[PDB]
RNA sequence: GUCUCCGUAGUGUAGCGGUUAUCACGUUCGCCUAACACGCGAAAGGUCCUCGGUUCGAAACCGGGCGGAAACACCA
RNA sequence: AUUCAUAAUAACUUUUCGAAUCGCAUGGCCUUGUGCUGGCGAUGGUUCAUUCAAAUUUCUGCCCUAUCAACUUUCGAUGGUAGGAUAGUGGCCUACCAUGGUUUCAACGGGUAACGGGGAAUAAGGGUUCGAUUCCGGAGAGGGAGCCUGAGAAACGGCUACCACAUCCAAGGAAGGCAGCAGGCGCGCAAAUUACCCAAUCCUAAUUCAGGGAGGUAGUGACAAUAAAUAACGAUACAGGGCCC
RNA sequence: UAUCUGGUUGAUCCUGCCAGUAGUCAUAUGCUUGUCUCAAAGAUUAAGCCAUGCAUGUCUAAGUAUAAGCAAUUUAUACAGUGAAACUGCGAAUGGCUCAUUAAAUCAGUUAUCGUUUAUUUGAUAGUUCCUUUACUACAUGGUAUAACUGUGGUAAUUCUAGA
């Protein structure tokens, strides 16, 4: 938080994914880490883009406190961002919302009861109502 | 949504006990008609007709064979109002231990009275059951009730109101010395065998207005059974105390390990849960719960739920174990423990060293009164005398008793449903009390 | 085992390839191509681990279906290609074309080559046959099939294949003065020339490749490759042109570069 | 079926371990570079065995011997450059005549006792454990470091450490609350 | 879990509702040597598994509990 | 090194292939017309080569036993001829003919708490023991046999039959092979959760999107390995080691 | 880190064995157990038997749709956008588990296929198919169902199936 000093390192340009990436090195004097959302404020006007257009990721800080490597990504568009960029880490800023698919286990057996049928079922859905209603 | 309740049966010898509740579980949804109409021709060949209703019931070789309730068996049915299941209770005095075992876990009680001529004067008798039955049931905490005058069509004339009157005084003079209010219960005439005012109001009987009862809760007014066991209350769950669950059976279930079974008097057992039973000391994980082949997430107190063991073993498990979570206070073995019991008639006099088979709960054991603190009064534990020299009949006292052999028990203030017991000896109702202190193991 | 298998544990893959131990345990099998999964580098570990490009197996999925590189003229759209020796690939973006040439080492290289040295490949013939039609034709160690070739052209020789229209442009002989190539075997990566070779008519014919710092060692034929005549390499040779310095001279070189 | 990861043991139990002579040795060299284990002895001459045998094997060859020369200078500039050999001593026999003392001088815990910060081996010991010294920038709480010369002088206490200027501390903190509050 | 056959000194194990004792081994005790040893000369060793009654009176008459010795059972 | 690749003759086919498939952008010539030409692709197709492979095959090498010394050939054993079958060579099989082939240089028969190897423990050297178990090559889906589909199976998370097991039965009938991932009984000295995710490493499909108990993550875990807390530092009461008076 | 010791005898020197000693990706068990990293784990006896829940299905710009499915075409009169199910084309013979059988057998190093098959890929590769081949025939193009679906259903049950 004081005198971050947000060092890059070992910066490439690839015309090929639209992003320039680089192992990012980050100081964190007296404090203990720098949230990842300050990271990616600070790394806007540097790289002189916005905030919603960089990624980072890992932060191990190094033992005995005082230093964190990670490794960081810049975008150049939004949409540059939304066709590259993995759904996780979209969810995890403010970029996409998770929706859930239930689970593994519901959705296998929803699946295997699927298979057990062949066909829509409509007509043997009426035709067991028709037959199990008494 | 139906709320969940529990009862047990109880009568004489001959009353038609699983007659009636074996015919009522088949009215309510309990099994199809070719399930009974099997067991009607198995039965026919073996020379029972009558018993065919018992039969669903009375399940194993030597009871069908006899035409005899040995052991308690269980099975649901769903009324109008929530959902319940029975116990059998045997009705003998051979037996009389099984009864104990099975009214002790049970919320209310149908006790079925016989109307023919000659059976009734038999059933309530020295030597019949009707008194004992009715007696033990208060003793081990079954506080509502219901009567059932049972077999209206074998009296002479059939279907006499006269009859049925008389049985209702008789059994209101008799109820009243016990403890229960005839007021409060409910006294319905019916026919198990035949299948009358069970269901459906009766056409044998238009005479029978209906019965009533006059509680603080709220009044009721039925014209069957069915309505009767509607009408009874929900009971109070201590769902927030630790779990006392005094086990009821251990199954090897195929494919699924071992299986505890039991009723949660206090507390809410669940799948991923360790156990300790209390006497043998066995500590171990329970794998699922299920009730009445049906799967349960939450096993609520007063349920007939049934964990599974694993990691251990079915013989380090056990009927009478009280799986207090291994995490909170569990159940420990008593060493001795203060229990006062007043006494029904002991023919012989009650000193010390007497064990007689303490069916405290599920489980009953011998213990030795070690001496006699005090000769107490009847009632509110007003002391009378310091150190008394003999007991006798119709007197209570406070008793300091040790186990012939280990044995589980607990405190009344803890555990109300735990706290319970009786006294036998001399094949009869010696005693009757309630433990207020215990020394762990 | 009851037919074909599909799947390569990181355990028994190249170890050309550089590839680590505990990520995963598989490896990029290769699918089938011009080049064995033995003699040959997919796309995906090319542009992951060499190239560094990517990062996960996706990026390289995205990059490879966004129609960016450019293999041997053909675009190619799967991970698992078999590139090998004499594959060059074209990338539209970033102006680079990089060629798979080995190195001193014993791997693969990530030397540049001019837009010029990528417009063709030099191939060595495998076969020769009168197919047919009665038509001649040739087989590079690719496996492309050239119809029509030089009479002069036999077993064992190097063609200049012009890789946009696929036609053969030059052919260099193999005799003694020549500079070659070796592909495969504990001597690879090394360049240098023939003095002279026993024919030795029951397989593995061996040949005396000499290095311009008088170094000499033995490979079968099966592993050269010619690239020219002495002193003139028709190819842009690798940084260090397969000296072969020694675990003594390596650390010297390194001292006097720190 | 991912490929299974390397472990190696690093001390080597004693043939005879029921020996006073031996015993008594270790004993006074334990105590003398404050060491708890004698198995950190069993290691620290695990891998004087080690360093031995691969010497040994290299002086039953030849001179002017390509494997002799490279695995001989490299061992050679790694013993110098850790500080067991000195400079005027390399030449590939006095490697031989290596003793576990010269390698547990080197020790950073001995180290730190040579500069002069702890006034004791023991108190060195908890000054490693506790985080009051650190190396370079770097804060070390392992015991045995094995400084290279280099490090030596980057030997200092850390920023983050009360000794070393500061935040005060836990104790002193609440000694000295406890005191500002009744005198406040 | 239900049903059946037995339970008796220390090992053996008798024996028999008005009352439990015997028998060998053993268990000790005086005997000698130095400790012995054999040789010897004498006597210490059971709520009749536990409880409850029947009971003038029971361990044995009866029933409950336990122990052991045998069975059949025991799908939340 | 070929009766090799290949070409041409005379025929054989009941006849193989030689595009009736699909998506975008829609452009030019004029004899001004649903006239005539025309791109970037996908799918499929006969043959050759290549690649991922598959199947045979040359040489050498495996534990203990002679209280196993002869083995094989009835009814295949050795070799030859010719023919069937195979995707191919071949007793692989058949018909005929000859009587051969192996063996103290350890055949053959028996046991194996015997899948083999890369390797592991142990030590100066030599060597001994172990190796089911993460990788490679093999066998099996309870014990055998048979077969369809497909390039590829003699497939069992594919069928058919028998035997030993075993499930649902309103007694006619139907449905199964956990030595796959968890979990249950039994066995024993002896060995884990009936959890989460395709986020990584890969594989497969028409294919960037989907699926994968392959796999990864977490939980149980003192199988084995690495580092390393449980204590240090001043002042006072004694007891010292050089030395000053 | 090329090392020994104790025990036959009144005592000595030997042979000789027993025991001690240290290690084990050799297990099992006991007592105790605070931390970080890494991590084996139903093989040994039973390749003994399995309840239950999963473990392989799959599409693009580009095989087939009028879902009597969903939004809007308004660039589209035949759809031409998205798209369940089904037909079709592929995969399901990979992977995973176990070590029962097996002692020139498997397997390892090393050769051959001039003695064979080879999906999928990669690079190439069909002016010659109207057969009295002039009416014998659409080639700005042929024929036939069938699934899904609509409705009738049967069996207690099955990933059971019929008729229209």
Not at chain 2, 133 to 153: E, P, W
Not at chain 2, 377 to 406: Q, W
Request: hydrophobic share 35%.
């Amino acid at each position: 938080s004081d005198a971050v000093t947000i060092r890059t390192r070992k910066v490439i340009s690839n015309p090929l994914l639209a992003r320039k990436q680089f192992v990012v090195d980050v100081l964190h004097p007296n404090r203990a880490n720098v949230s990842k959302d300050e990271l990616r404020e600070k790394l806007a006007e540097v790289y002189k883009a916005e905030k919603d257009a960089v990624s980072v990721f890992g932060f191990r800080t190094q033992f005995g406190g005082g230093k964190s490597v990670g490794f960081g990504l810049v975008y150049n568009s939004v949409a540059e961002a939304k066709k590259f960029e993995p759904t996780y880490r979209l969810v995890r800023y403010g970029l996409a919302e998770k929706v859930e698919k239930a689970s593994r286990q519901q959705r296998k057996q929803k699946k295997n009861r699927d298979k057990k049928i062949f066909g829509t079922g409509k007509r043997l859905a009426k035709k067991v109502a028709r037959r199990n209603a008494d | 949504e139906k709320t969940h309740i529990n009862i047990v049966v109880i009568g004489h010898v001959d009353s038609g006990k699983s007659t009636t509740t074996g015919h009522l579980i088949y009215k309510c949804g309990g099994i199809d008609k070719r399930t009974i109409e099997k067991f009607e021709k198995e039965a026919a060949e073996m020379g029972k007709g009558s018993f065919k209703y018992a039969w669903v019931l009375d399940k194993l070789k030597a009871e069908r064979e006899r035409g005899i309730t040995i052991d308690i068996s269980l099975w649901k049915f769903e009324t109008s109002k929530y959902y319940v299941t029975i116990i059998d209770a045997p009705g003998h005095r051979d037996f009389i231990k099984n009864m104990i075992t099975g009214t002790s876990q049970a919320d209310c009680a149908v006790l079925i009275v016989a109307a023919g001529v000659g059976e009734f004067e038999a059933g309530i008798s020295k030597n019949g059951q009707t008194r004992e039955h009715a007696l033990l049931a208060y003793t081990l905490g079954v506080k509502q009730l219901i009567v059932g005058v049972n077999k209206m069509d074998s009296t002479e004339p059939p279907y006499s109101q006269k009859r049925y009157e008389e049985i209702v005084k008789e059994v209101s003079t008799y109820i009243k010395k016990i403890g229960y209010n005839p007021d409060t219960v409910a006294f319905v005439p019916i026919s198990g065998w035949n299948g009358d005012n069970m269901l459906e109001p009766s056409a044998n009987m238009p005479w029978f207005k209906g019965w009533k009862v006059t509680r603080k809760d709220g009044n009721a007014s039925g014209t069957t059974l069915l309505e009767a066991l509607d009408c009874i209350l929900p009971p109070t769950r201590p769902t927030d105390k630790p779990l006392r669950l005094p086990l009821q059976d251990v199954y090897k279930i195929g494919g699924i390990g071992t299986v505890p079974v039991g009723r949660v008097e206090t507390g809410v057992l669940k799948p991923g849960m360790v156990v300790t039973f209390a006497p043998v000391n066995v500590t171990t994980e329970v794998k699922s719960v299920e009730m009445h082949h049906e799967a349960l997430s939450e096993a609520l107190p007063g349920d007939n739920v049934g964990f599974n063991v694993k990691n251990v073993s079915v013989k380090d498990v056990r009927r009478g174990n009280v799986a207090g979570d291994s995490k909170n206070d569990p159940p420990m073995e008593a060493a001795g423990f203060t229990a006062q019991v007043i006494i029904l008639n002991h023919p012989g006099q009650i000193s010390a060293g007497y064990a007689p088979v303490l069916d405290c709960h599920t489980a009953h054991i011998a213990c030795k009164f070690a001496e006699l603190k005090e000769k107490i009064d009847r009632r509110s534990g007003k002391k009378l005398e310091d150190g008394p020299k003999f007991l006798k009949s119709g007197d209570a006292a406070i008793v300091d008793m040790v186990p012939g052999k280990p044995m589980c028990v607990e405190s009344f203030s803890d555990y109300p449903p735990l706290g319970r017991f009786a006294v036998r000896d001399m094949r009869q109702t010696v005693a009757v009390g309630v433990i207020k202190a215990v020394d762990k193991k | 085992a009851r037919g074909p298998k599909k799947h390569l544990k990181r355990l028994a893959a190249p170890h050309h390839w550089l590839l680590d131990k505990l990520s995963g345990c598989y490896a990029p099998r290769p699918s089938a191509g011009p080049h064995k999964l033995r003699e040959s580098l997919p796309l995906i570990v090319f542009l992951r681990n060499r190239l560094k490009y990517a990062l996960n197996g996706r990026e390289v999925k995205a990059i490879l279906m966004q129609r960016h590189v450019k293999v041997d003229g053909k675009v190619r759209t799967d991970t698992t290609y078999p590139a090998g020796f004499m594959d060059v690939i074209t990338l539209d973006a970033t102006n680079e074309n990089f060629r798979l040439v080995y190195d001193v080492k014993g791997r693969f290289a990530v030397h540049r080559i001019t837009d010029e040295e990528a417009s063709y490949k030099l191939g060595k013939v495998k076969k020769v046959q009168l197919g047919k039609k009665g038509v001649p034709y040739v087989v590079t160690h690719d496996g492309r099939t050239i119809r029509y070739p030089d009479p002069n052209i036999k077993v064992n020789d190097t063609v200049k294949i012009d890789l946009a229209s696929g036609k053969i442009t030059d052919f260099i002989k193999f005799d003694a003065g020549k500079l070659v190539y070796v592909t495969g075997g504990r001597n690879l990566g090394r360049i240098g020339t023939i003095v002279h070779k026993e024919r030795h008519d029951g397989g593995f014919d061996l040949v005396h490749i000499k290095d311009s710092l008088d170094n000499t060692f033995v490979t079968r034929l099966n592993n050269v490759f010619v690239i020219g005549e002495q002193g003139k390499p028709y190819i842009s040779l690798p940084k260090g042109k397969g000296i072969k310095l020694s675990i003594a001279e390596e650390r010297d070189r390194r001292r006097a570069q720190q | 079926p991912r490929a299974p990861r390397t472990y190696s043991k690093t001390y080597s139990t004693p043939k005879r371990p029921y020996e006073s002579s031996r015993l008594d040795a270790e004993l006074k060299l334990a105590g003398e570079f404050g060491l708890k284990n004698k198995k950190e002895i069993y290691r620290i001459s695990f891998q004087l065995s080690k360093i031995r045998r691969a010497a040994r094997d290299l002086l039953t060859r030849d001179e002017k011997d390509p494997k002799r020369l490279f695995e001989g200078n490299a061992l050679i500039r790694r013993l110098v450059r850790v500080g067991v050999l000195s400079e005027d001593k390399k030449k590939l026999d006095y490697v031989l005549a290596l003793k576990v003392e010269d390698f547990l001088e080197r020790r950073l815990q001995t180290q730190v006792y040579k500069l002069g910060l702890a006034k004791s081996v023991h108190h060195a010991r908890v000054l490693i454990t506790q985080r009051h010294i650190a190396v370079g920038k770097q804060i070390v709480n392992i015991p045995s470091f094995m400084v290279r010369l280099d490090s030596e002088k980057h030997i200092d206490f850390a920023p983050t450490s009360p000794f070393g200027g500061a935040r005060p501390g836990r104790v002193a903190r609440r000694n000295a609350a406890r005191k500002a509050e009744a005198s406040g």
